[PDB]
Structure formats: structure tokens, C-alpha cells
Amino acid sequence: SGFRKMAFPSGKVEGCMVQVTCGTTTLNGLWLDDVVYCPRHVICTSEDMLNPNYEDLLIRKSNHNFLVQAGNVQLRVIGHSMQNCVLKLKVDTANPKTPKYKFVRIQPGQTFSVLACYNGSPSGVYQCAMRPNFTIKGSFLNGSCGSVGFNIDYDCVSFCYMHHMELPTGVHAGTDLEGNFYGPFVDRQTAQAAGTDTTITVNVLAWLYAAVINGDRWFLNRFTTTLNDFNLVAMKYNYEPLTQDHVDILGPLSAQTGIAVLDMCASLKELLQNGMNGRTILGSALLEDAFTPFDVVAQCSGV
Amino acid sequence: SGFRKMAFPSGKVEGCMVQVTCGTTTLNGLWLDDVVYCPRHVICTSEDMLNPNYEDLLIRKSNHNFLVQAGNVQLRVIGHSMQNCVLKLKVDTANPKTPKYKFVRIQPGQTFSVLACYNGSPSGVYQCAMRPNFTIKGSFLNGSCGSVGFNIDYDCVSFCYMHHMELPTGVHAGTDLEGNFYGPFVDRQTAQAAGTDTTITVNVLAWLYAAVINGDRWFLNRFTTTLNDFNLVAMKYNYEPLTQDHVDILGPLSAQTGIAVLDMCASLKELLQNGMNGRTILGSALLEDAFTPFDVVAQCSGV
Ligand SMILES: *[C@H](O)[C@H](C[C@@H]1CCNC1=O)NC(=O)[C@H](CC(C)C)NC(=O)OCc1ccccc1
Ligand SMILES: *[C@H](O)[C@H](C[C@@H]1CCNC1=O)NC(=O)[C@H](CC(C)C)NC(=O)OCc1ccccc1
């Protein structure tokens, strides 16, 4: 038993990270087959990052302006193109460690693992949730751009995130691997604001089931409620409304514990109105929404 | 002069539309080079559309189950793969009418042209705006899926939308050309709800400039306001808050008319609080948010 925020093993991705330098700007790239993907602002100097015209910037470069290193080995760039906010560099060597992979775009509320890298070298791995306002709460310093987010299904790596920027509030924003931003952001060094964030209700319920499976039962009661009565309370506290599809997704957890979803909603309703009164759930004094129902099933189905 | 909702000329796209049939299900496909892109629910029967398992459905098909027609010519399918919610069919013939093209994902508030098609045959063309809740207000009947949305920049067609479904409220939802949905929808025939829609403020201001350029000036006054004072009124009426970037985007229109952006906001503030009192602007009795500042510049800069 036990319940921990955990990331996928990063081995398959570590073999794909390279260092990309253009001028005095260095960041990370993702090397799959004979292509290196990286944020397009690698072609910027500092004066350029306030209002870059990327099309002008790119036409003034040639292949030999791009320094790509895979550890010690230097990769020869033989072509380059821009695809939305990512640069695609054709190199002369296919990465022999290329895993089975796909490019997917995730939805708010879903989780993924981030492999933080600096200078082409993996540094740490952690799980993030895509927030309803299309930001993530990461840990990123200068030089981290081009670090990627991913999930592992079967033997296949699904890449879903590439890191580009930090917003003034300390949260992080980036693109999918086709170069399209999550959220209404642009890759310019100007002050941008994210929308209001909300709490992911289906995730909170999944985490309350995890708590019950691990022996934290103090917040349960015999009450029940209806979807409508719950959703009217939820929207007062900035919680996402709950759909019938969410109830269905929680099925396996309701079956394993014998506690119906609408019963758990009544417990959540009480915690929202009364608070937790110095009590904790799974070691937290706050309601956690960072775990999907699938994350919970993966750690709790064996209990 | 004059101001009309207009679509891009559709010629370059008309040459790319084909008919795709699998079983008794027929819809449209987009034929670029030697690939035909179409919604993956073409592989569904009716019993399948309530809860399809697309991976199971696809493994039970072979290339010869797919009938692709380009007018009279039958195209031979020699491979197939699934990419998120789109099917990619490799055919034996490259489309000789393939334009210069790219796949882009648009943001809420942006506009694009829809070429509505049935049985691989273009039927009509109209402009749409992507709503803040990731739906579009289209006109689509059975058989329209696989119709595409696009913009024309220079000589290049930017495809941004492929049509998949109608929601219970009569609005429409679909994917980008990589198969990733706009909004939190799935390609299942179940009741799904879109989020609350809001009014796109920068677009309304652009349209008020269009009105002034065309001689509709009755709503102007000498007042001015600040961004903060405006945004506090705007959020009471379900308008998107206005950013400094929006003010900058309106620059060319403020210059052409000599009316500062914050001056126009004061006029908008008054129309929101007082209404229009049976008066019209550009032939409408409502405030229109379907035109971007770039749409307005394109029709009004010559005036
Ligand atoms: C790329 O490595 C870098 C990642 C930033 C650095 C601090 N934390 C991050 O996530 N990105 C940028 O510097 C980015 C480049 C623009 C052309 C998009 N700008 C950015 O994030 O500016 C805000 C900021 C910069 C430095 C420290 C804190 C915030
Ligand atoms: C594809 O041609 C079709 C387009 C619909 C038909 C009515 N207007 C449209 O935009 N799509 C579907 O039938 C779609 C298929 C699922 C597997 C995603 N389901 C759908 O839109 O169901 C709602 C609906 C169906 C028929 C009429 C009105 C609404």
C-alpha cells in the first residue's frame, strides 16, 4: 500500500535528449530518427526575445549556425524548418535509441511526466498535471527549454509537452510536439497572464478513493446527494462541474471500495463547507487534484 | 466601402476533397500528396458510435475495406494508420493539385473559412470564429464530416479544422489536422456539453472601428476610460478582459480613424450599460464579435 506522486521511468526518453546551440543560446532538443525538435527561440539573441520576427530570424541562419551535440558526438545539421513554435533540424544520423513513439496533445486534468534537462543532460523527473488554464506547476531554471513531457503506454512513449517559458506568477507554459501552444500564450518575452485556475473535481474524488483504500476513512458519512445539488455547491468554491462521464470513469474505484460516487460527493461537499479542522488525508492538509482516476487505479488496484 | 462577412476563395481546397466510404458510412476526406485524411469514425457502424473502441475497430479492417473516390477516379488504398482522431489513408496516387500547405492549430477568437462538403463534393463556403469554449457556430448536416476549415496566407493554405460532430445545443466541434480535438470533447455519440461562452472583446472593438470607417459614428462620445475601469465593467457582461496586447493589435485602426483605443472602450462601456435603443451598427442590432482586427484591416484599410 501507500500513495505517492510518481513519474514514469525516464530511460527511453533520456536517450533522445541532445544539446542545441545557436550563437550564445543553448537549450535542449529531442532527437527522434533523423530529426531534432527544439523551441524556435533558440535562434534569438536577447534583443530579439522582446518582439521576435521568427521568419526573418530564421532566413538569416544556415545549417552550420546550429551546433547539436549528443553527449560528445557532434551531429551534422543538413536541413532546418520551422513548424509553428518548434524548429525541426534534419541531422545526418538517425538516433539508434529511438523508441516507439507518438505525438499527442493532452487535455486539462490529465497528468504526464517531465524530464527536466540542462545542456542536453537529464537532471530530474517529476509528474505534472495540465491545469484548466493550460499552465503547469513545474520546476524550471534557465537552460531548461526543450525539456519534454511524456506518458508511457505499453512500450510506446507518447510525447505531449515541450517547455518554452515561465509566466510572471511562477507557473510554466509550453507547446505540444507539433509546436502549438497549450493556452493563449506566445513565445515572446512579454508579460502574459494565465486565466483563472479551477480545481479538477474528478481528480479530487479519485484521490479521496485512494485515501479510503489506504485506510483514511474519517471524512465519510452516510449522506448522499445528486449531481445537480453537488454541482451547485462545487461552483461556489471554484470546482469544475461533475459530469455523468466523470461518474462512469470513477466506476472501478466505487466498485473496489463499495462507496458510490454520489456518496463520496456528499463527503466532498462537507469538506468544502466545513474544511478539514486540522485533520489530514494521505498526509495532506489540502484537497489534492493532481491525480487522475487512472493514476489512482495504478497504485491502488493491488490493495 | 462596405463591410461583409467573407470567406477565402475555396478553389485550392476544392481540388483536395474526396469521398471516403467504409461499409455503409460515407464522409469526406482531404487528399494531400499521397495521403487522405478523414475522421476516424468512418470505421463505425451505428451500434459502434455510442462507445467505440477505435483500436479494436481498426484492426478488424484491411485496406480494401476503404473506398476512396476523387470524383469518378477510384483511389487505391495501400496503407492506413490512426493518428489521434483522424485516419491517415495512404493511396497509390499523389494528388497533382496539392497546394502549398501547413497544419496549424488556431486559438479562440481567430477566424477561418469552412468549405462544407457532402459526398466529396463542395457545397458552400462561409467564415467561422473559434469560440472561447472551443465550438464553432456552423451549418452542417449528415454527411458533412471531414469538411475542413482553412486560411490563406500568401499562396499557402493553412488547414486548421476538420469537422466531426454537433453538440446538443446546435453548435459544432472538431479537430485540428493532427486529430486533436478543440475543446474537451471526444468522438462518441454521447451527450456532451460545451463550457460557457464569452464575448470576444477585442473583436467587438475591431468591428466598432469598421463601423466608424464606414460612417456609423452615433455611438461615439468624448469620454475616455482606463483598462482596469473597462475590464471591471466588461466582466459583469461576460466579456473577455482586455489586455495591453489587444490595445497594440488595434493600433492600425486607431491610427486610421484618429480614435484612441481607450476612447472606443468608453463608447463600448456605454453600449453595454445602456444598450443600443433600437439603433443599428453596420446593419446589426447586436454587438458582433466574429471579426478579428485583421479581418477588419483587410476590408477597411483601403477606405
Ligand atoms: C528556456 O530555457 C527558458 C525557460 C525559463 C527560464 C526560467 N524558467 C523557465 O521556464 N525560457 C525563456 O527564457 C523564455 C523565452 C521567450 C523567447 C519565450 N522567456 C521567459 O520565460 O521569460 C520569463 C522569465 C524569464 C527568466 C526568468 C523568469 C521568467
Ligand atoms: C459527420 O458527418 C456527422 C456530422 C453531424 C451530423 C449532424 N451535424 C453534424 O455536424 N457526425 C456525427 O454524426 C457524430 C459521429 C460521432 C461518432 C462523433 N455524432 C454527432 O454529431 O451526434 C450528434 C448529432 C447527430 C445527428 C444529428 C444531430 C446531432
Author numbering:
A (entry chain A), B (entry chain A): 1 to 303
Quote the authors verbatim.
A critical step for SARS-CoV-2 assembly and maturation involves the autoactivation of the main protease (MProWT) from precursor polyproteins. MPro of SARS-CoV and SARS-CoV-2 are 96% identical in sequence and thus are similar in structure and function. Both enzymes are ~68 kDa homodimers with each protomer having one active site C145-H41 catalytic dyad. The protomer is composed of 306 amino acids and organized in three domains, I-III. Domains I (residues 8–101) and II (102–184) exhibit a chymotrypsin-like fold and connected to the helical domain III (residues 201–306) through a long loop region (residues 185–200).
However, we succeeded in obtaining a room-temperature crystal structure of MProM in complex with the reversible covalent inhibitor GC373 at 1.75 Å resolution. MProM crystallizes in the monoclinic unit cell (space group I2) with one protomer present in the asymmetric unit. We modeled residues 1-303 in MProM-GC373 structure, whereas the rest of the C-terminal residues are disordered and are not visible in the electron density map. GC373 is covalently bonded to the sulfur of the catalytic Cys145 generating the hemithioacetal conjugate. Interestingly, the nucleophilic attack of the sulfur of Cys145 on the carbonyl carbon of GC373 is not stereospecific and occurs from both sides of the carbonyl carbon such that the hemithioacetal hydroxyl group is observed in two alternate orientations. In addition, the phenyl tail of GC373 occupies two alternate conformations. In both MProWT structures, Glu290 of protomer A makes strong 2.6–2.8 Å hydrogen bond interactions with Arg4 of protomer B through a salt bridge structure. Thus, because of the E290A mutation, three water molecules W2, W3, and W4 invade the dimer interface disrupting several hydrogen bonds between the protomers and contributing to the increase in the Kdimer. In MProM-GC373 instead, apparently caused by the R298A mutation, the C-terminus flips in the opposite direction towards the helical domain so that Val303 side chain, the last residue visible in the electron density, is as close as 4 Å to Ser1 side chain of the same protomer. Room temperature crystal structure of MproM shows that E290A and R298A mutations destabilize the dimer by excluding all direct hydrogen bonding between the protomers in the vicinity of residue 290 and retaining one hydrogen bond near residue 298.
